[PDB]
Design a protein around this nucleic acid. Structure first.
Ligand code: A1IDW
Ligand code: MG
Length: 540
DNA sequence: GACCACGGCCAC
DNA sequence: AACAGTGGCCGTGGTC
């Protein structure tokens, strides 16, 4: 409907657009349109009509702003109805769902998408009248952030391609050595990547005992948790775990990332998805740069392929024990506050208990293990499972979990307060009022209910940490531009910046402090910073 | 070619 | 595998 009016559109219209593909840095702009009033404007030529707009306002605004930066046009994103819906309910994650929940249909034509962004904005902005805290998250965090992420997306990161090509051939020859040493240990060749075939070999032809089953189809599981408990029980299980790590890293990172360098930028560009998680975290895709390996030695080799441009340095900043400090603030547990008001490290302490060694002896491989253990226990891992992780008695793990929550008694009072409040209001909230609707808290099936409970009390603390990080990013981005530095990646509690060599020390010291004082809590936020030519040695 | 479900596994 | 939570991508095995 509306009324075809001649392009250009008046100021502050709502833009709709169609891309050749979902990735803004790689897409052709097929159609461009705008609407304000009862008028829909359609562009004769989309790439020239981008010159006319002063701001991107509408569904998926960040995406068009990214494509604009790719053509050297500073066109910042503004209002996006997706961002309002996502603050109303974080299950509002795609425009198909949002339009089919607030009064329209998400089609494939720019004009119709423009007019939809106009009405979708009116509706949701009305639904947020009086939700002053969500209106605060919108004006102060989420809408500014979409601009920051647009500049991150369009900048990209430099990758050592020749090095990854070379690493590919090396890993390939090693995969072949393990494959053959499994085909032999099994008396024949089969597809080692087919989990079904491997099931028959491990559990039928050989004699190994099936520890567990898969969720949907009830097959015998060949997961690492299962195979780890079948080590020494046969050497072939050890080789399969080696083969699995290598083909994972090769087919997910080593091989596809080099072929994704952009021809204009010479760099690698991810997408930061702003309305994609239930807790408020960002996500990253196409490629996901938030899960580049690091823990294993081959993984470290891959993390080193992410490097600074000629004449710059990477600066890496990572909040320490972030969800535990948030937890101390949220609960008000005094003993836990006192841990951080005294610079204690709960991952290195759990690691010394867990390995026997003195605190001065825990090395990175050990601390990493205690991180997963501590966060495992915190969010409700069963005694029985912990006893299988730590290889201890069951009543020994019950005490580890009773000692853990006894040294900080006020936490369980907060878990319970959080749950009871969620049953009454239907949602739980972070420190700034970001909310997750958790309807299954009154479920009558125990398993469905207790899962709802674990998602329910995790969200306030993980979404508070993500709120801090996002706010730090909007406070830091303007200061980095003064110094001529840039933001590259965010990995949940961590930032990577690129800075000129003769300014790196300055941007590190600065960025460290903006992050630490983003929002004073009842506990000091520490940050670790490092500088290097590559992502790995930046992280000290 | 394009989707999809599933088990599996990388990061935080 | 499971009474830890949050993501996204892979190959396999299908269907259309
Ligand atoms: O299993 C987990 N479950 C979970 O819920 N998280 C959340 C809570 C954290 O606060 C937050 C930030 O992760 P993080 O930065 O790595 O942890 P942290 O800030 O507490 O520690 P430090 O920076 O001081 O080393 O992710 C993290 C982990 C986890 C285990 C682990 C092992 C590694 F080898 C490397 C990274 C790891 O992540
Ligand atoms: Mg951290």
């Amino acid at each position: 409907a509306l009324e075809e009016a001649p392009w250009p559109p008046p100021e502050g219209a709502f833009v709709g657009f169609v891309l050749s593909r979902k990735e803004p840095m790689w897409a052709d702009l097929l159609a461009l349109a705008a609407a304000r009033g009862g008028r829909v404007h359609r562009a004769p030529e989309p790439y020239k009509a981008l010159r006319d707009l002063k701001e991107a306002r509408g569904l998926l605004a960040k995406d068009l702003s990214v494509l604009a930066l790719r053509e050297g046009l500073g066109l910042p994103p503004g209002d996006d109805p997706m961002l309002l819906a996502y603050l109303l309910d974080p299950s509002n994650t795609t425009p198909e769902g949002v339009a089919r929940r607030y009064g329209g249909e998400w089609t494939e034509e720019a004009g119709e998408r423009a007019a939809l962004s106009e009405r979708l904005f009116a509706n949701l902005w009305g639904r947020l009248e009086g939700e002053e805290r969500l209106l605060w998250l919108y004006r102060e965090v989420e809408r500014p952030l979409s601009a920051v992420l647009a500049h991150m997306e369009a900048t990209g990161v430099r990758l050592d391609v020749a090095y990854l090509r070379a690493l590919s051939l090396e890993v390939a020859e090693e995969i072949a050595r393990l494959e053959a040493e499994v085909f032999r240990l099994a008396g024949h060749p089969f597809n080692l990547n087919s989990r079904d075939q491997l099931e028959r070999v491990l559990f039928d032809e050989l004699g190994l005992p099936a520890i567990g089953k898969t969720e949907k189809t009830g097959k015998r599981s060949t997961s690492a948790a299962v195979l780890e408990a079948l080590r020494e029980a046969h050497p072939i299980v050890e080789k399969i775990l080696q083969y699995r790590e290598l083909t994972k890293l090769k087919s997910t990172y080593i091989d596809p990332l080099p072929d994704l360098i952009h021809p204009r930028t010479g760099r690698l560009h991810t997408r930061f998805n702003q309305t994609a998680t239930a807790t408020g975290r960002l996500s990253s895709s196409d490629p996901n740069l938030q899960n580049i390996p690091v823990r294993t030695p081959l993984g470290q080799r891959i993390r080193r392929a992410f490097i600074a441009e000629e004449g710059w340095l990477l600066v890496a900043l990572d909040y320490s024990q972030i969800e535990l400090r948030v937890l101390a603030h949220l609960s008000g547990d005094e003993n836990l506050i006192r841990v951080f008001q005294e610079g204690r490290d709960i991952h290195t302490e759990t690691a010394s208990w867990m390995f026997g060694v003195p605190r001065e002896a825990v090395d990175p491989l050990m601390r990493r293990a205690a991180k997963t253990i501590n966060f495992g226990v915190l969010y409700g891992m069963s005694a029985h499972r912990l006893s299988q992780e730590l290889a201890i008695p069951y009543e020994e793990a019950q005490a580890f979990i009773e000692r853990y929550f006894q040294s900080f008694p006020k936490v369980r009072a907060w878990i319970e307060k959080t749950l009871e409040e969620g049953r009454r209001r239907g949602y739980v909230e972070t420190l700034f009022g970001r909310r997750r609707y958790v309807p299954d808290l009154e479920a009558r099936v125990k398993s469905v209910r207790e899962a709802a409970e674990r998602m329910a009390f995790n969200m306030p603390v993980q979404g508070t940490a993500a709120d801090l990080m996002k706010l730090a990013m909007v406070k830091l981005f303007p200061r980095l531009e003064e110094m001529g530095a840039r933001m590259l990646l965010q990995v949940h509690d961590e930032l990577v910046l690129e800075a000129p060599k003769e300014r790196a020390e300055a941007v590190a010291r600065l960025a460290k402090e903006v992050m630490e004082g983003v929002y004073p809590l009842a506990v000091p936020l520490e940050v670790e910073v490092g500088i290097g030519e590559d992502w790995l040695s930046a992280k000290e």
